[PDB]
Symmetry: D6
Subunit: 166 residues, 12 copies
Amino acid sequence: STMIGRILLTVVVIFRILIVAIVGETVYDDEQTMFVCNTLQPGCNQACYDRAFPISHIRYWVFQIIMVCTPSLCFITYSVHQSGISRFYIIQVVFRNALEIGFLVGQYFLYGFSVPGLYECNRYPCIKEVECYVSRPTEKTVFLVFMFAVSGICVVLNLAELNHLG
Amino acid sequence: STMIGRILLTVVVIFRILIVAIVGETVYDDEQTMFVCNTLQPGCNQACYDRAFPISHIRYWVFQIIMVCTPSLCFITYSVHQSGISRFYIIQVVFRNALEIGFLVGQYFLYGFSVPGLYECNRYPCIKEVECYVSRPTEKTVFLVFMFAVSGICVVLNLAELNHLG
Amino acid sequence: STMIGRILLTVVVIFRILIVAIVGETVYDDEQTMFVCNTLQPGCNQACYDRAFPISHIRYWVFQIIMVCTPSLCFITYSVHQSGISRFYIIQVVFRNALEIGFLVGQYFLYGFSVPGLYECNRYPCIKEVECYVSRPTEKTVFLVFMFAVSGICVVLNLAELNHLG
Amino acid sequence: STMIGRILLTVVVIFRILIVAIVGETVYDDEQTMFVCNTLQPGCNQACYDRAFPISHIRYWVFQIIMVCTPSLCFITYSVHQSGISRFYIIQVVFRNALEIGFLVGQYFLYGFSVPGLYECNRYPCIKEVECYVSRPTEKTVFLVFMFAVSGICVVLNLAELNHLG
Amino acid sequence: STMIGRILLTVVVIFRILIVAIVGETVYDDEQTMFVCNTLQPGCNQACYDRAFPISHIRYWVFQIIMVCTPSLCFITYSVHQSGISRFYIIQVVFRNALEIGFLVGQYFLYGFSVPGLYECNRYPCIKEVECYVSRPTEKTVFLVFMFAVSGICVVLNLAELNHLG
Amino acid sequence: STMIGRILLTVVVIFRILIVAIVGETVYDDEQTMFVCNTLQPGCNQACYDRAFPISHIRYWVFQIIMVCTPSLCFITYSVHQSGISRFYIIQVVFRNALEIGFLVGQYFLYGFSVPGLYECNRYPCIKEVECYVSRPTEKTVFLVFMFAVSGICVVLNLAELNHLG
Amino acid sequence: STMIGRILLTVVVIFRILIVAIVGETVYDDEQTMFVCNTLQPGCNQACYDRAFPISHIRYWVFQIIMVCTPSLCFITYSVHQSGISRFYIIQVVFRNALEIGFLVGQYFLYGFSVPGLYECNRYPCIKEVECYVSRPTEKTVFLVFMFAVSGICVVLNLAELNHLG
Amino acid sequence: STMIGRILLTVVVIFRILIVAIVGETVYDDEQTMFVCNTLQPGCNQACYDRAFPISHIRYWVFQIIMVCTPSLCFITYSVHQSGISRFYIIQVVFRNALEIGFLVGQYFLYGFSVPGLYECNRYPCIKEVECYVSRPTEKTVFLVFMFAVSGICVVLNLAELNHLG
Amino acid sequence: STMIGRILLTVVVIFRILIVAIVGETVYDDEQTMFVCNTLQPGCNQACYDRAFPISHIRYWVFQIIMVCTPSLCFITYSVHQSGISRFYIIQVVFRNALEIGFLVGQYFLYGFSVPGLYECNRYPCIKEVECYVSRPTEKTVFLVFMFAVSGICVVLNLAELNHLG
Amino acid sequence: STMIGRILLTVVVIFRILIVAIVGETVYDDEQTMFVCNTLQPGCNQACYDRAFPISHIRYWVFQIIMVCTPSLCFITYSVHQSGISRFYIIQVVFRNALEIGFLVGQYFLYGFSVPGLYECNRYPCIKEVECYVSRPTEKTVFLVFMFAVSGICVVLNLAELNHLG
Amino acid sequence: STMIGRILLTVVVIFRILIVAIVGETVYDDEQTMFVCNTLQPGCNQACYDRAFPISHIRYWVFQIIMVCTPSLCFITYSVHQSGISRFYIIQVVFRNALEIGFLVGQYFLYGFSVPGLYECNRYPCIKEVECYVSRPTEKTVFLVFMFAVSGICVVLNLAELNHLG
Amino acid sequence: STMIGRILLTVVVIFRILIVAIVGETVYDDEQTMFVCNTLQPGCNQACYDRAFPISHIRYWVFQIIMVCTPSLCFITYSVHQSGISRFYIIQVVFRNALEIGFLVGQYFLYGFSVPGLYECNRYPCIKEVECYVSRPTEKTVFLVFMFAVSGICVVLNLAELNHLG
């Protein structure tokens, strides 16, 4: 039972990396070029876009992907320099669990579960409140849901292994 | 008879991957830049494009290509870790068959058999119904038909092998 | 006499692949951005471009290049799995001949021998007949002629070898 | 205690290089295309952009990354040519410390701790003072803070090792 | 004396290839985007550009570079298949000489020795004669002269070796 | 004393190549797109840009980098073919010195020590004298100074080694 | 009682003429210049304006004013030529009554009682139905009501006098 | 019976003059400013407008009005100079009849009975045939019909008087 | 004392008429051409202008001027037809008083005492609330105050005369 | 016979004045606003219009009309001051004849008999020769012919009277 | 001496009225259409024009002309009604003097002695201070000076007559 | 001889007034709308037009016409009030002579004898010197010459009469 867990964890990790690397960068290419607001004021588009999307999804996902694989690099470097291993194993497993749970919660609190098509903006220099229109909301919603599902699976597997070792 | 089946399956898979990888990404490059609607309303182009093409063909095809090759990766990882194999063989064959049939049916229900040149749009903020015009419909229709034919061939071969093993 | 034939065939094939790969993709880059028609109607440019150039030359050439090298891949895979070979040799030679002749005839019937500088278009929504102007006709004509010559040489060599074996 | 220091230093260095290389170049892509000032004067945008951002952040970071790894290259070349090593070791450690502290102080004095959204410009040919608007200030602020934190960690580790050797 | 000739020939060939490959493709990038004519007629820019520059310099140079190295590929393939060699050596030397002289003469007759800054155009649909303006004439003139000098050196060396063998 | 000279020369050469290769090509990307002159005359921008910047800095630097490493290639090819070496060593050292001094003097006479922000242009078809505005002058000035310093260091080291051998 | 009727009739007639002559012509001056429809189709504005306002109010009112005073001119010309008068008097009174009632009914059936601010148009070449926006609807509504009231008063007075004579 | 004929003729003449003078000049004010054709060719609007409307209606009507009152001026001048009168009376009546019939027939042959909303134009420099759109067709049709009716009434009355005198 | 009252009343009336007639019509000429709102929505300018200024000041003043002089016309017509006069005198004085007081109160309730420079508009099709900018507010405020003062003087004089007669 | 000559001369003169005064000024209103040339050069329209039409037809006709009636004014002033008359009569008749013949010949030599629709212009700052397009050529041709006919009639009558007096 | 004073006063008054009436209204026609400010802000032109020119010169001059002739109208009406005259004469002379002096002082305090070509504006919604440019400053300065001189002459003459009567 | 002088003077004066009044005002209508300069600077057109044409010709001519007829008005007013006359006659003749000579000299010194088609302008805010283009130079030159000739004739006649009286 615990034999297949490692295989499934590795396959899920590789799948997530490949999906993020091959396709993600071209959905978000024209995010700001195709953002439009109903106004004649110079500088309102910049402020309203910056308020609507403080950090892009793809930047967050790349950062998370790189950060969640650091314990393995530390373990490999330690083993290479050596050339209490179980203590290092346990510590790295715990750290991986904590990092993954933290990142999942942060994603939920940053983005939610959908991308709406309209936005209401009231930042200077825009006069009172204006309405702005988003590009490709449906595809971005699908991406959000898919990423959340994959991260949940990863968390479940890590908890399973942690409870297996005891 | 069953000897040539594996060779033909491998050749078809490689051919599909190469065709999708080398040429597909540049037909769909200007999909939204060359989309135009007859109107003066800001934000109508975004809504009508999003309603006409919820998910691009190329995204769907890349996802399908990556997803239909996961059982082989699982088998290879299992064999590497080992260094009832027939049980794994049978299970992976069954899973491949199911995944391919599901993806083919999903493609048919998502896209149909052609891409029309005109589109009729009635989404907010567009007033009543408007007419929009598509880029490169004929080439996209040819691509659709070619992909459907290749996927059908793959399904036929997988069913043949499944019935061969028994 | 038959010794040099194989060398010349290989050199011609490699030359064709290199020529298509290095230079072809940048002549056709701006095909639709620099296409213009004399009109004020929205959507007329899309329809007239789609009617004038249903499939781009470069797409056809890439498809042909990939398709005409499949018998070699099948032969290599068969030999690798084995690790009546002459029957496979004869069959693959025949198939290569048929594929090359078919593709040459298809090219002739699709494109002809030149690219004109003006086009007359009468497709909806354009009112009556309009005149449109093409980008880089002379270079494209040169490319067409060069490709036809190379394909003819390849056909001649394949027929020579087929008659040599008997 | 001193065993883990080298591992952590190497991991931090690799992390910084990867973060700068993979994501940084695409945040700053449209820095000058999306810079706008409220005026009708030709040439005012160029002058005001040049005054606001004399050197881009990414150029400075690439230069610093390349410059802080030169002592290692010198050491490797010396060892290769040889094929008082401790004297070279001490000297290169000292030089690395000095370079890192200098670069950190220079960053602080060049950029500060945030990127504001508005800029006030009074350079010829602009008449009196004008107001200009910046692109993506929040993301750039986050990047600044992250880079400062990483560089501080590196400085702390280098000082720790220097005091360890004595 | 004949020892250094081969070394100088190889170095010159590699230098020419590197110069053409690294820098040439970006001087000619905006050739047609920055071409302008003084007129209000739609379609006049296309016709006048096509008449002024039938084939780009870079296309011609790439074709020549690829074509002048085919005898070496034939010789290598012959030697590999073998695993009267002097007859092949002599024949390939003669063919190289002929190809290089032909290409040099063709370049001279196609392009001349300079690129002027103004062009006078009288092609339909332009009314009578119009004046058009070229991009980056000085750099292109420098490139032309440099390429001519290199090709002349190559021709001289090939003739030297041909006379050396006798 | 003469041991470290070779190491420092190699490190400086590699540093210069890396700096030119990684960052230089993107500072000069928009040189002509963001060049503007105060006028209504068609064709004046082309003439004034061509007069202000006959050859780009990056082209000159790439050419110099490639040209100053040819003696090493000649030496390596000679050694490979051999498989009076000191005569070749001395000759190549002398040639390297001459080439580097010539290129440094040429740079000084071509470009000077700074890039001004305004330019005064009086070339046909511009009427009398006009004023034009440059993009990113400060960064280009910094680049100029840095390159001059590096080249001076290289010249000093080469002269040192030449005097060392005697 | 019948003495004041003639005075009131004359005063009302003069008042109507003055009101129409002095102010009416400048409310309707920009009727078609400030008419706008939401579309990109050439020729749609003309068709939709022509369908919304077949005849301008001011043209109708001028025609009516001129036509309702013809019997007086006929009577004056008859009297001048003479230089059964009661028969002419009765006949002209009857004709005036009939003309005024006919014109009032025609106005009601042509225009109604208000001018709306939006219009829905479905005439060729407009595609399907479009929305258009009117200029100065409130003032035109006030004018309509005022004119109707005045005409009603005139009709009442004419009927009163007709019944008075018997 | 013949007494009322003169009165009715005078009243009709005055009515026609007043109608033409007060209202006609402002319907045709924007005839060429609001004329539009679907094309990008300079000079096509001028040619197509000139071909569609060689002479404006209002010019023709003013000319006719002035020309049909010349016999009265001649008669008055003759009487003033005198200060066979019946011969002059008869001659002027005949001339008036002839002029009025000629002008009515000319109007019918020049303009017809309606103004269409679309026009098809094939004059140089327009390429092939184009479609153009007219301003205020309905009002102009009403004007045409009204003028024809009035002129017919005038002709009938003149013939009546001519037959009365005998 | 009562002798000068009539003279002052006549002079004030003539002064008001002259002031309104000579200068008023050219202050309000460009009221709608120079009205601007900050928005990209078609049709918002029309709605917001119509809501801000339902009836122009000049139209109201012309109507009032014409309406307040009708009793004099009635009196003159009565006297002419006659060719209890005191009863008519008293009645016309009373009617003039009532009309003037009513018009003054109506002006106060319609317009107030100033014209502001900014307007806030929330009418369909404008999205939420927008800001619009007025032309020549100061001059229009001066006009308003001047007209109010003149009308007040007229009312005072009419009341004085009414109380004088008793 | 000579009695009717004076009447016909007066009627013709009055007719010419009325025709020129009422209609002529509005055909030529938009002469320069609707003049267009195919070019991008600033200032070419002004030069080409000034070269095509040095003096407008209407200016010439007004000048001629005023100048040909001066002898009558001189005669009237002489008679008024008096309050050899035949000598003045003869002299004024001769002067009128001379002035009319001179003006007719000048018209013929200035304008010819038609107005063409296209014009070829080669004046600075236009580059080489350009093509320009005229407004309302047919109506202007009709006007030219009509004016020539009227002037010819006037000349004939004046010569008739001159020969009558003897 | 006092005889010529009245004649000169009348001539000066008539001259001033004629000069103001015939030419003044067309210098100020395009005051706001040709007013321009260097900015991209909507609504800044309106505010800055309103602040620079609160009341137009021509409005002030028309008001003054009408107001300074009221005493004569009062005197004429008094004389007509009469059909102590010296008391009225003296009173009207005094009132004329006071009105003229007041208007001259008001002109000086409102406008000064020149119209500058540049204006500096700092009113909302303009950001900080902007620069605006005036139309026809020199002609307006000449007009100002001429009007001041004429008014001064009038004041001098009125004072002369007042002192003459005593 | 002196009898005809008065008649010719009156006729010339009336002719000049009529010519200036009927035609002059419409040649200069579009003087500033059709003035263009080759530049991108806001405010340069205003400054350059104001420098080229400080006072319009028509304003100067109207002022001169009004000013040269004041002595006659003074004489008429004196005669009317009277109802040494020769002293007034002589004085007014002298004053007329002086005024006419002064105005002619002023015209010559202000305008010269022709209007050129190009203008060179160097006023702030224009950068250095720019070129501007004038509207209708030939017609304005003709007008200048005609006016000068008429004024010269008037001066000659006035001097003749002055010498006649003695």
